[PDB]
Amino acid sequence: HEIGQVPLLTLEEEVELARKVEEGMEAIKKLSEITGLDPDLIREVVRAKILGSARVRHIPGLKETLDPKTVEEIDQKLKSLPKEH
């Protein structure tokens, strides 16, 4: 019943979503270099706020303990960048 709640995509919605996913990963790679940070850690910090703070935990492989303290600090550097960045 719960998977019948999501309508299935049309060919354009499918390619739209697929489109944005890949472009989003290219986004995060370049944000590693601007920032001097680590793509995986940026990946999880981007990840955190889309899902909500419902899910926040330590992710295996990341160097920092991922708690609201560090995701706030890392998010506000992310937002401290020029508008083109």
Partner: protein, 52 residues
Amino acid sequence: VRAAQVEAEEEGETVYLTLFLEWTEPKDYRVQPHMNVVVPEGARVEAGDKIV
């Protein structure tokens, strides 16, 4: 179509209007499923900008 400046010369029983006219010419472009339009409705574009 509209007329900005109007200069007129007279000769015999006629007048000749050198019309500084201003208008927009439409061209239609067809989008297909694997392309995305990256321009919003009513955007301004110079020669060479990307639409889809």
